[PDB]
Amino acid sequence: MLRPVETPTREIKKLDGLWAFSLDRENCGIDQRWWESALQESRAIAVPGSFNDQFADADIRNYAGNVWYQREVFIPKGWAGQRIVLRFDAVTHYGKVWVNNQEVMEHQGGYTPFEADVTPYVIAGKSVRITVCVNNELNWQTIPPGMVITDENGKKKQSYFHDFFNYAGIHRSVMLYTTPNTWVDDITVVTHVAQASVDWQVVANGDVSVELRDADQQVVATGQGTSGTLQVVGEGYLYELCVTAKSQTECDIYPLRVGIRSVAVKGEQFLINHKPFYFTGFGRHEDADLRGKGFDNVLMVHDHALMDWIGANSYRTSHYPYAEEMLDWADEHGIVVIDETAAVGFNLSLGIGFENKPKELYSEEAVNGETQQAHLQAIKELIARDKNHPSVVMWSIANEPDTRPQGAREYFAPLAEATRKLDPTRPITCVNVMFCDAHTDTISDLFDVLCLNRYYGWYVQSGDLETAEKVLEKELLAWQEKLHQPIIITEYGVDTLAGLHSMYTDMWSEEYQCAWLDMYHRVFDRVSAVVGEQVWNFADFATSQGILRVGGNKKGIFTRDRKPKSAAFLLQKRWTGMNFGEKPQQG
Amino acid sequence: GSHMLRPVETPTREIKKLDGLWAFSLDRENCGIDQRWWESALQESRAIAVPGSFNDQFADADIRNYAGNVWYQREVFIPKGWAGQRIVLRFDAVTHYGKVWVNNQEVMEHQGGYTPFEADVTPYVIAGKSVRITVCVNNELNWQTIPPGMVITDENGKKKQSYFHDFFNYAGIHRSVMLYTTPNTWVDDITVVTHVAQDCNHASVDWQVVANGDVSVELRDADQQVVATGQGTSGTLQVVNPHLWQPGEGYLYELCVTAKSQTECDIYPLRVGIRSVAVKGEQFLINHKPFYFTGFGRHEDADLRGKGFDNVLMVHDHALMDWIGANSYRTSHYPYAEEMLDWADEHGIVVIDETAAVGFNLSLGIGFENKPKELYSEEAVNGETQQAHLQAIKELIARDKNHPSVVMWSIANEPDTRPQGAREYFAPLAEATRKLDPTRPITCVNVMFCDAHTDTISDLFDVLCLNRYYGWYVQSGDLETAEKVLEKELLAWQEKLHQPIIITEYGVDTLAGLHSMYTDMWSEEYQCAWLDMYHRVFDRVSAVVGEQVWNFADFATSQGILRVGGNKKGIFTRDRKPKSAAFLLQKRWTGMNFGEKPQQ
Ligand SMILES: CCC[C@@H]1NC[C@@H](O)[C@H](O)[C@H]1C(=O)O
Ligand SMILES: CCC[C@@H]1NC[C@@H](O)[C@H](O)[C@H]1C(=O)O
């Protein structure tokens, strides 16, 4: 499965915004089969957006259970001789959908599309009732995991183990799509460099021809057959190889953009086209002021303008798969992307407070075999749909897992190996949490380049930069000599509320963010193996409520409404001072 | 105005073209028209989101303050199952000036920044292939624009736009772009008007221009059960025993007009609410019952889209207004996105509909630095200006005529009526508006300094709308003098005109977080105290039938020593968080009985 693009392939975008929405507090929907009649006592909701914060209501915001969307649609008239298929680009956590009293789809996965042919349940020209049942619950076999808890009164409350807030709803595009009656499924392409080759595979209903055209889209070379190899002689050139499906009586044309993408890892260097690289940029989040994680074109354009100004050339889709629009953008603009799945919270050592969670991390009570297989499904879907993007430069299996407990490597080994089985073109990482240090972590052996999320001077060095530097440097050198891999610091940052200034350079002040980030920068400058720096969050984002979070995680370089803290000008001076992709040497 | 109805979905349809990502480029030296950029793909472009203002999408002050022409562009595949159908391309709002090319054929031109414009473009496309849409957008204001302004060119030829309204002059394609298909039998326009007597029964006269054929109509129920039927291009009266459109509820029948040609059919559903507005003495009646307006002057303004319409923003802002107890609002200083008038229609929100005629006043800006000396004059507000204004009223009424939520038209906001020729200007505009729609009252929002003994034009309008700021811009910080001045000025207006009085703006700048024990200006405590005193005075004047505090949220403005990052008069911050006064109003507005004036 890959993204619908239009040519003699058509669609009616159904991000019509306003659907009928209703909560299901007493779980009556399935039994009264609500999809059967117009929702009783509904309210208007926006459909590219989370349902949590759109109504300024704490009881919808913290709601756990089943919610219901509904929307009627007229199917276009020129589709009577076509297959009508219905695609949701992201339903966060779980979705099941009924096209007029007949059930059509079901899917467990919050950041990946799922589609299904409904041509035998539609006829072009008339109006059908679409009803969606969305679930936002997490158990130990979900990606990410969690524990629902039902109190004395029967009220559900969801507990989880990741920082960001558990936003849910229809966060991305809904889509009615038609394609000619022979070509259905997937295409895959792989690219090589010689210090200039390709490959093709199409799955459709008949003969296939493929022609690579360039940005002027004049044909630069053509083959036809499911496989073989053509050759050819800040932001990146994207050719376009146009694959055609000659068969039955109708032809089908699909355009797939390809970039000359190359890379594996070599010793201590993350090369690109046989070129050393330094990652600069951010751990991101899909989080905005009123839409939750809902995608929005304005926000995307503005935050790319911000990363462009600040000099970042890369980022990482922190803790879940992102809106594909962003990877198409990264394609055209030459942004380097670390693709991560929703597998966060595999750790019960991070929660901090005054408050019964399972005692053995890897076991049947928690992360079991079912968990490992749901995980492998998540990696499967992320690779299945982002495989042809040039901007995806590395896969990341999970984020900050607890690898101290027994059973950790028995769990993660088949996943690393299987993912290498899923695509050998790009490297494999697993971002490492602070407390599984160099002397302790179990799984770093299995990955190509190890990524570190370290916060010396914040969570563990009590605001004392002068010792934090020393600790961070030992640990740096230790990691490299233990694995002689490239080191990408994927998370590093401190909570700072915009407006707090202090002569004493204290924690939470803007001066402290500046000083802390630049001391980290000084040690980066001095160790061979660090090939990347991505600060911990570009903007402030929302989290669940707790004594550690003042209205959200304030570790951002920008505020939630995208206004710059002082450190935004620190980074801008450093990241645009170096030349592109090259690390500042030691002074 | 020219015939136009909202594109609604029947067995003939529309395909959304706000795909957001278009090619955008500014035209710094007007090379665009000369090289007719409309001919080839835009040279040196960057991605823009549509709909949204272009000013703040790139976090760059040099685009933000840019004056001149900008260029949007996008290819489109026209669906082929549309062959033998009329294809129309509608822009719902291109702010200030826009003209567009279907690759090389130019199709439309428009100077109104907040009202739609379309053109039948069936002979310039054929279904199945993809054509390039190129749009030229101008953000310049002169004295014949609505609103007016003065572009001024420095020594170097760079433009800088000067204007005389508070809010910032956002531009771009702010609303929906859209290709839509209709059968070759045209239902070009519909007009519906409602009457009632004692809530028991009456009728909805009707008129329709349907360019191509016979028309029958059926008014259907919320159950879509037929409750009456008509026949004819006009007349089309039927009588009912209905459940009529009321503020708290908003019951909407559906007028299904069908246009039978000899081979083609066309179906249009137009939602109607059975409401009757009028004014009698000092009372604003709705279904023959006095009404009390509560709520806000609003704005189309958010943190990164400028004035771009956004569904989440609409849903969340209605959630807040509903919580806070607001029952009404007015589309402050320009026509709003029709989505909002449909929302108000379905939910029973009462709306004062206003045109973009702000800044007809050179007495409001205050500072230390060349504006014309005669407001009404050939160099400034001129005859061309008056026809431009009459055109703006023509489009707004043409587009929001059948909405039950629209309860009153407002021609302009805070014009200076002191100079002679103010009444010469506004009188024919008031009379013309009255003939363009006799169903709803006519207002013209009154500025603080054209007081009751000074104003010239209020004679000409049905309901008096006051923007008062005693205690803020004058009597600054003194609640005891502001109360007296306000109360005698209110009583004065009542003695002079015996109209209903709606206080359509009253508010103070309040920094969220700034608290004070001394109840001084800019603190949240001052907002509460100030609004609260104003509320005692309203409660003590017979003729005041409405209160709309000045601004629901903080919004952006031009830069100046009076605007701290914008106008801070909102009850909510720009990111919709409530100041302390937000709970003051919530206590009042849900304490009173719905639609009733507090009895003191
Ligand atoms: C010491 C663990 C740090 C933690 N790392 C994972 C991110 O998802 C969180 O945002 C970050 C944080 O605490 O902000
Ligand atoms: C005395 C004029 C007040 C003025 N009235 C018009 C609004 O558009 C402005 O926002 C408001 C203000 O200055 O706050």
mmCIF file with all atom_site columns, N, CA, C and O and ligand atoms in Angstrom, chain A residues 163 319 350 399-400 435 455 459 491 536 541 549 553 555, ligand 1:
data_model
loop_
_atom_site.group_PDB
_atom_site.id
_atom_site.type_symbol
_atom_site.label_atom_id
_atom_site.label_alt_id
_atom_site.label_comp_id
_atom_site.label_asym_id
_atom_site.label_entity_id
_atom_site.label_seq_id
_atom_site.pdbx_PDB_ins_code
_atom_site.Cartn_x
_atom_site.Cartn_y
_atom_site.Cartn_z
_atom_site.occupancy
_atom_site.B_iso_or_equiv
_atom_site.pdbx_formal_charge
_atom_site.auth_seq_id
_atom_site.auth_comp_id
_atom_site.auth_asym_id
_atom_site.auth_atom_id
_atom_site.pdbx_PDB_model_num
ATOM   1  N N  . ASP A 1 163 ? 5.715  10.316 27.551 1.00 0.00 ? 163 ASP A N  1
ATOM   2  C CA . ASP A 1 163 ? 5.568  11.707 27.974 1.00 0.00 ? 163 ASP A CA 1
ATOM   3  C C  . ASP A 1 163 ? 4.340  12.344 27.326 1.00 0.00 ? 163 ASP A C  1
ATOM   4  O O  . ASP A 1 163 ? 3.414  12.758 28.029 1.00 0.00 ? 163 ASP A O  1
ATOM   5  N N  . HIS A 1 319 ? 8.391  9.196  18.208 1.00 0.00 ? 319 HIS A N  1
ATOM   6  C CA . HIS A 1 319 ? 7.513  8.335  18.997 1.00 0.00 ? 319 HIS A CA 1
ATOM   7  C C  . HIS A 1 319 ? 6.259  7.877  18.275 1.00 0.00 ? 319 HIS A C  1
ATOM   8  O O  . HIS A 1 319 ? 5.380  7.285  18.922 1.00 0.00 ? 319 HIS A O  1
ATOM   9  N N  . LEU A 1 350 ? 10.839 5.022  34.412 1.00 0.00 ? 350 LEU A N  1
ATOM   10 C CA . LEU A 1 350 ? 10.888 6.446  34.115 1.00 0.00 ? 350 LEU A CA 1
ATOM   11 C C  . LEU A 1 350 ? 9.874  7.260  34.879 1.00 0.00 ? 350 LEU A C  1
ATOM   12 O O  . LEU A 1 350 ? 10.104 8.450  35.103 1.00 0.00 ? 350 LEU A O  1
ATOM   13 N N  . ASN A 1 399 ? 11.679 3.590  21.183 1.00 0.00 ? 399 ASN A N  1
ATOM   14 C CA . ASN A 1 399 ? 12.299 4.720  21.862 1.00 0.00 ? 399 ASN A CA 1
ATOM   15 C C  . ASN A 1 399 ? 12.351 4.513  23.368 1.00 0.00 ? 399 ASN A C  1
ATOM   16 O O  . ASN A 1 399 ? 11.320 4.303  24.016 1.00 0.00 ? 399 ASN A O  1
ATOM   17 N N  . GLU A 1 400 ? 13.562 4.645  23.909 1.00 0.00 ? 400 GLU A N  1
ATOM   18 C CA . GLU A 1 400 ? 13.890 4.514  25.325 1.00 0.00 ? 400 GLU A CA 1
ATOM   19 C C  . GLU A 1 400 ? 13.273 3.308  25.953 1.00 0.00 ? 400 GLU A C  1
ATOM   20 O O  . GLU A 1 400 ? 12.507 3.382  26.966 1.00 0.00 ? 400 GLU A O  1
ATOM   21 N N  . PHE A 1 435 ? 19.301 5.709  31.593 1.00 0.00 ? 435 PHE A N  1
ATOM   22 C CA . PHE A 1 435 ? 19.732 4.913  32.715 1.00 0.00 ? 435 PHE A CA 1
ATOM   23 C C  . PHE A 1 435 ? 20.198 3.534  32.296 1.00 0.00 ? 435 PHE A C  1
ATOM   24 O O  . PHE A 1 435 ? 20.733 2.789  33.127 1.00 0.00 ? 435 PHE A O  1
ATOM   25 N N  . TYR A 1 455 ? 20.481 13.603 29.401 1.00 0.00 ? 455 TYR A N  1
ATOM   26 C CA . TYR A 1 455 ? 19.984 14.791 30.084 1.00 0.00 ? 455 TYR A CA 1
ATOM   27 C C  . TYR A 1 455 ? 20.806 15.069 31.325 1.00 0.00 ? 455 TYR A C  1
ATOM   28 O O  . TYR A 1 455 ? 20.284 15.508 32.353 1.00 0.00 ? 455 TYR A O  1
ATOM   29 N N  . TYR A 1 459 ? 17.928 15.936 34.840 1.00 0.00 ? 459 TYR A N  1
ATOM   30 C CA . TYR A 1 459 ? 17.294 14.928 35.687 1.00 0.00 ? 459 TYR A CA 1
ATOM   31 C C  . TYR A 1 459 ? 18.248 14.289 36.672 1.00 0.00 ? 459 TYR A C  1
ATOM   32 O O  . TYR A 1 459 ? 17.804 13.808 37.717 1.00 0.00 ? 459 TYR A O  1
ATOM   33 N N  . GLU A 1 491 ? 18.188 12.852 21.772 1.00 0.00 ? 491 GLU A N  1
ATOM   34 C CA . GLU A 1 491 ? 17.474 13.823 22.590 1.00 0.00 ? 491 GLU A CA 1
ATOM   35 C C  . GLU A 1 491 ? 18.404 14.567 23.520 1.00 0.00 ? 491 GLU A C  1
ATOM   36 O O  . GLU A 1 491 ? 19.156 13.931 24.238 1.00 0.00 ? 491 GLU A O  1
ATOM   37 N N  . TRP A 1 536 ? 16.130 18.103 22.114 1.00 0.00 ? 536 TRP A N  1
ATOM   38 C CA . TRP A 1 536 ? 14.852 17.547 22.533 1.00 0.00 ? 536 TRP A CA 1
ATOM   39 C C  . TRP A 1 536 ? 13.825 18.655 22.510 1.00 0.00 ? 536 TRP A C  1
ATOM   40 O O  . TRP A 1 536 ? 13.791 19.549 23.366 1.00 0.00 ? 536 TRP A O  1
ATOM   41 N N  . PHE A 1 541 ? 5.053  20.948 23.937 1.00 0.00 ? 541 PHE A N  1
ATOM   42 C CA . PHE A 1 541 ? 3.922  20.093 23.614 1.00 0.00 ? 541 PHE A CA 1
ATOM   43 C C  . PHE A 1 541 ? 3.219  19.664 24.896 1.00 0.00 ? 541 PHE A C  1
ATOM   44 O O  . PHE A 1 541 ? 3.736  19.827 26.000 1.00 0.00 ? 541 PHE A O  1
ATOM   45 N N  . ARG A 1 549 ? 5.357  18.561 35.108 1.00 0.00 ? 549 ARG A N  1
ATOM   46 C CA . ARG A 1 549 ? 5.026  19.199 33.844 1.00 0.00 ? 549 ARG A CA 1
ATOM   47 C C  . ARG A 1 549 ? 4.139  20.410 34.091 1.00 0.00 ? 549 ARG A C  1
ATOM   48 O O  . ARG A 1 549 ? 3.014  20.259 34.583 1.00 0.00 ? 549 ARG A O  1
ATOM   49 N N  . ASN A 1 553 ? 5.207  19.660 28.446 1.00 0.00 ? 553 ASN A N  1
ATOM   50 C CA . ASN A 1 553 ? 6.666  19.592 28.427 1.00 0.00 ? 553 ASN A CA 1
ATOM   51 C C  . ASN A 1 553 ? 7.200  20.901 27.876 1.00 0.00 ? 553 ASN A C  1
ATOM   52 O O  . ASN A 1 553 ? 6.935  21.228 26.721 1.00 0.00 ? 553 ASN A O  1
ATOM   53 N N  . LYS A 1 555 ? 10.343 21.718 27.204 1.00 0.00 ? 555 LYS A N  1
ATOM   54 C CA . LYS A 1 555 ? 11.699 21.508 26.712 1.00 0.00 ? 555 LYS A CA 1
ATOM   55 C C  . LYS A 1 555 ? 11.908 22.075 25.312 1.00 0.00 ? 555 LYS A C  1
ATOM   56 O O  . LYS A 1 555 ? 12.996 21.919 24.742 1.00 0.00 ? 555 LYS A O  1
HETATM 57 C C1 . LIG C 2 .   ? 14.952 11.018 30.875 1.00 0.00 ? 1   LIG C C1 1
HETATM 58 C C2 . LIG C 2 .   ? 13.837 10.711 29.892 1.00 0.00 ? 1   LIG C C2 1
HETATM 59 C C3 . LIG C 2 .   ? 13.558 11.921 29.006 1.00 0.00 ? 1   LIG C C3 1
HETATM 60 C C4 . LIG C 2 .   ? 12.394 11.722 28.040 1.00 0.00 ? 1   LIG C C4 1
HETATM 61 N N1 . LIG C 2 .   ? 12.905 11.002 26.867 1.00 0.00 ? 1   LIG C N1 1
HETATM 62 C C5 . LIG C 2 .   ? 11.763 10.567 26.050 1.00 0.00 ? 1   LIG C C5 1
HETATM 63 C C6 . LIG C 2 .   ? 10.951 11.747 25.564 1.00 0.00 ? 1   LIG C C6 1
HETATM 64 O O1 . LIG C 2 .   ? 9.731  11.253 25.043 1.00 0.00 ? 1   LIG C O1 1
HETATM 65 C C7 . LIG C 2 .   ? 10.541 12.624 26.715 1.00 0.00 ? 1   LIG C C7 1
HETATM 66 O O2 . LIG C 2 .   ? 9.870  13.760 26.163 1.00 0.00 ? 1   LIG C O2 1
HETATM 67 C C8 . LIG C 2 .   ? 11.787 13.009 27.482 1.00 0.00 ? 1   LIG C C8 1
HETATM 68 C C9 . LIG C 2 .   ? 11.382 14.012 28.508 1.00 0.00 ? 1   LIG C C9 1
HETATM 69 O O3 . LIG C 2 .   ? 11.389 13.733 29.801 1.00 0.00 ? 1   LIG C O3 1
HETATM 70 O O4 . LIG C 2 .   ? 11.011 15.111 28.157 1.00 0.00 ? 1   LIG C O4 1
#
